[PDB]
Amino acid sequence: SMGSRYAVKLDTDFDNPKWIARHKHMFNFLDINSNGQINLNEMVHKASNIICKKLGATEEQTRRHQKCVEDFFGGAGLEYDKDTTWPEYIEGWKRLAKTELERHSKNRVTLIRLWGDALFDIIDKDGNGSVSLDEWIQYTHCAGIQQSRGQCEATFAHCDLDGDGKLDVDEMTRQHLGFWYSVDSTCEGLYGGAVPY
């Protein structure tokens, strides 16, 4: 949406209702039994036993992806064999967003970039660090985070695509920094409304 030389927004906007609504939407989504809590075991079950198995990851790809998911949700305060409720979750996410943006400001790779690298190694069949529209539909619909083809098309329309019409991990990482962490207006619309704003 801003080209490849766009400088990431590095400050936070945690009291913005759009930020709150994005994470409340995801919390309710992840709270599969609607009991008001989630844990890391559930996140990793989803990641390894559903997403990686169905999308054809090798055992080693699955292991790498799982460590990235552990680290990402662990950075928001989730733990194995311990349950997390919404107020705790959203406070933990303020801490995650802050430490991720701080990492980026210091040229240290982010947990969300490491996750993207691990996921794209599985779902990018050509191997150049970018995914086609059909690969992105398959991932997002298996994860459940997008549910219609039009939402995925909106993601591709929003993002700046490479020469081959594909979504590169560096672009999706920049978009994620602005969508999940800093509330950057230029990243609004990233999930085509499947996740709000």
Ligand X SMILES: O=C1N2C=C(c3ccc(O)cc3)N=C(Cc3ccccc3)C2=N[C@@]1(Cc1ccc(O)cc1)OO
Among all residues, which ones are annotated catalytic? 23, 93, 139, 176, 191
CA angle (46, 51, 53) in 5-degree steps: 110
Based on the shown chain and the rule CB under 6 A, indicate whether residue 115 belongs to the binding site for ligand X: yes
CA distances (Å), origin 168, targets 36, 98, 103, 123, 179: 35, 24, 21, 12, 16
Structure tokens at 168: 């590169």
Based on the shown chain and the rule CB under 6 A, indicate whether residue 98 belongs to the binding site for ligand X: no
Q: Are 166 and 121 in contact (CB under 8 A)?
A: no
**DSSP readout, 77-129?**
T-BTTB-EEHHHHHHHHHHHHHHHHHHHHTTPPPHHHHHHHHHHHHH-SS-SS
Based on the shown chain and the rule CB under 6 A, indicate whether residue 136 belongs to the binding site for ligand X: no
Based on the shown chain and the rule CB under 6 A, indicate whether residue 145 belongs to the binding site for ligand X: yes
CA angle (146, 102, 64) in 5-degree steps: 50
Based on the shown chain and the rule CB under 6 A, indicate whether residue 173 belongs to the binding site for ligand X: yes
- Residues that contact ligand X, how many (by CB under 6 A): 20
Interface with ligand X (CB under 6 A), residue from 78, 97, 119, 137: 119
Interface with ligand X (CB under 6 A), residue from 38, 69, 101, 152: 69
DSSP reduced 3-state for 180: helix
Interface with ligand X (CB under 6 A), residue from 101, 112, 154, 183: 112
Q: Which of residues 12-31 bind ligand X (CB under 6 A)?
A: 23, 26
Q: Are 74 and 142 in contact (CB under 8 A)?
A: no
Based on the shown chain and the rule CB under 6 A, indicate whether residue 156 belongs to the binding site for ligand X: no
The residue of the chain with the least Cβ separation from ligand X equals: 116
Interface with ligand X (CB under 6 A), residue from 13, 46, 61, 63: 46
Residues that bind ligand X (CB under 6 A): 23, 26, 43, 46-47, 51, 69, 93, 112, 115-116, 119, 140, 143, 145, 169, 172-173, 176, 180
